[model samples]
Target chain A: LKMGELSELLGYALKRAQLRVFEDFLHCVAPVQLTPAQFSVLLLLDANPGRNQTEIATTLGILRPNFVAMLDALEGRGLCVRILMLTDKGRATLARAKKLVATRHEDRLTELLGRDNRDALLSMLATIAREF
Target chain B: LKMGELSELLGYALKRAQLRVFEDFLHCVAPVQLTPAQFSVLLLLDANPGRNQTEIATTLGILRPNFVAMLDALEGRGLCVRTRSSHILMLTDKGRATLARAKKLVATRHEDRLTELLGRDNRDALLSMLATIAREF
Candidate 1:
């Protein structure tokens, strides 16, 4: 069947683009076995250092109830020790994950969209994500 | 805490943008009570009439098991029906009416705000980039 106007729907295209990017994110980060949400959690912990679970959870858009389970899972993996601090192993893992995300996942996106177009695309998306 | 590189990550930006768009889509289409996925399904049936479940389901990236459930809900609501002879899908009169309203709401309420936020040219360019990433990336 012809895609018709479905191809033109912003929401549809956004969802599909998000899914593809996340798919690549997972593949690139698979060596560290971190999902995007998990990686974000680690990043938040690393960046903030002393912030509690509520602060980190709210920032990540993770719900209150779900946050504990995620923290538990990460703690079990030796990635994080408590709600606030990253374990040595967690920091190590996140360091590797960050490198992979930059060089592999984001680089591919840059290559695909080109530097100028990618910057424009990122700016537009950030606007929507921020204000729209 | 600072957003740090989260603000710069393409995947993060993509996810947040998609979430916001879908949230706006839900709010705009709330009167018709259709989800983005559901609206797309109806639009597909209206455009490509007499298609079977698998064709529509595959096109939308909906899994086979969940497709039947969604059809069951739509069928129960009288938005669409499956003909006995061919087991194909078709939108009902109500479905067409509902879709019409949905389209109007999407254009005037949902995308209007987005275009206003980004400007018409930038919105179009953004849509083009998203479509490129969706298809090629």
Candidate 2:
């Protein structure tokens, strides 16, 4: 690709990695059809129940309106409740989803790159995250 | 902050970095009100004109539907044109005008934070690592 210089850019490179992760994540959860965004919501709710919609939206870095829309889909599917909390269905589903997703996504990533290399990658990631 | 193990994941950190860069990019291009996605389109056409919609979309990792939506906003503002020709996505005079304006702002912030964060010595290696993470999967 002619993006040699652009590819060298941290933001461009980060985005490239983000896209690949997200694409795989979409496929990672395809059997359950949970988007990464939605899966994130479930986990957040599981961990921090009863937080208001706005707070959770900000926590997830999602705009409030978009957050609501995503919630609508999850609620419609009976995975989450309208009060912005998870249903019993969500907990059971999320638990299984996490296992599948971690195996297919995270586990595969570590296996592909090796454990030490993956750890190094995450360390490098935090190094940049601290700057931002 | 409460992302648990997720906070330690590479994708999570990449997103954190992207959102930080994106928020700054939007602020940088605030005068034009153009999004980073739109900015990428403008830069692509500026560098390699006549490339098709699919080509640009693939390079930037945007879906065709989302790509079309971004282009609609750009084309609506008289920056670009859509057509049936093979060599599609040509930039307008005004498009070049805006590109120059936004590029300067984005470039300055990039050099500042990138150097500030990664410093002069190790930045390239990290960027190479990012590319590998992107490609390895």
Candidate 3:
């Protein structure tokens, strides 16, 4: 029952943190009902207008097999059009999702860890994701 | 493509790091053929001897429904066994040996590369921050 040496594993720490952070992200963005991947796609559509689905897929590292289903969900939700651009609803929802992420989701982390700690933590994780 | 604000989010970083860390963990422990979750179970069973399946399930936060399948997989591999009378869970001799090999692999390959990449001090800080987030956030 006790954690014992299980707590010593860095992978355990990473897994737990990732789960908690994602849980909070879901809670924060529940109003818009966008998953992290979906939110990223919305952001992509907003930032890069007129891009095709293939471009978005490649950018997000999503392979063809899983990409269409995701886009299908977005399109079904009236959030995107065939050009892989945002529909009007998509744009509006994305604006709201962006606000939620910044003010509620990320602010919670900053509040918990403080600015310096949060930045340092993010930097270290980024290093692992990139270099390790 | 640009990452842009996605790069600034803590959850995004957490996800990327967790994915990469788990990937390396799988690679390092491939010889033992254990997943992080499975490895955690093996470690728990070894540390807390003579526990039951229910206790293991509770400790690992696994539901009874899913626990049976996992137990089945481990049993199928001959890594662990359960007592018929009390339904107690314990690792087999082979399980212990595999776990030992896994620990060595983890020390030498999985975390060694991580510590080498980030260095001791930064890796320690990263671990501390992650523990904090996992516990408090």
Candidate 4:
């Protein structure tokens, strides 16, 4: 079944915005040595501790097998640990990283889109996340 | 050196917003069988056809070695063919895909973010791209 022309346009716009966000995210988080995907995994784990590999992957929309190597890398670095609930140390590291990453993110948004626009963007994003 | 509290917060917010955008994008292009990265490559080629592997990788911020495997996969699928300038046929496939993808993209934004907000986001993204290419690379 073919979606209408509107669906097709939405797909393109979403992809463009998505790419723009990632490009900016890489710049914002470069010093921390965390990829956007890696950061997302950490953030989700922080918010919902005790989740398994499959659960983490599903929540992040990443495939389960793909997460195996990511977890291995994070664990090796001591930035992430897997347990029944992972470790407090793992959570602490993510918290620390998020602080740095979030600051840069907001600054970039403010500089690029202005403060009002940035806040609106965040609101829209939050709304979409809740709706989906 | 610690990068002050502001830097730290920016990193986290960027990650959060980035995740949201990607989630929406996946929904937008669900049946198309193309990842965001793949779509970027296709769009770049459509706009600047016949670029080489290294050039394409650099433009998209992907590593050259990583692109080898990506190209191999795309080529294997007959969706992408690599020649000196690639080929017109390969370009056509990507162009066709973009038409479909771009349409869904615009529609989703209007429904999700409202028309004005979506336009502003696009404008901001374009400005950042120009500034980043000048300042960072």
Best by lDDT: 1
Any runs in candidate 4 off by more than 4 Å, and if so which?
A1-32, A36-58, A79-92, A102-105, B1-62, B79-137
Pairs that collide, model 2: none
Can you write out model 2's per-residue Cα lDDT over B42-132, one digit (the tens) per residue? Answer: 8887787556787888988898889888888888999987655343878889998898888777778654666677665566666766677
TM-score of each: 0.93, 0.84, 0.91, 0.55
| Best candidate according to TM-score | 1
Q: Comparing 1 and 4 by lDDT, which wins?
A: 1
CAPRI-style docking class of model 1 based on DockQ: medium
Sort candidate 2 into its docking category.
acceptable
How badly does each model clash, as a count of residue pairs? Answer: 0, 0, 0, 38
TM-score winner between candidates 1 and 2: 1
Q: Evaluate residue B21 in candidate 2 and report its C-alpha lDDT on the 0 to 100 scale.
A: 72
lDDT score for candidate 2 against the true structure: 0.75
Show model 3 residue runs off by greater than 4 Å.
B58-64
> What would you estimate as the lDDT of candidate 1?
0.87
Question: How high is the TM-score of chain B in model 1?
Answer: 0.92
In the predicted model 3, the residue pairs found to clash are: none
lDDT on C-alpha atoms for all candidate structures: 0.87, 0.75, 0.85, 0.56
Interface RMSD for candidates 1 onward, in order: 1.2, 2.4, 1.5, 9.3
Ten residues in a row with the worst lDDT in model 3 chain B? B81-90
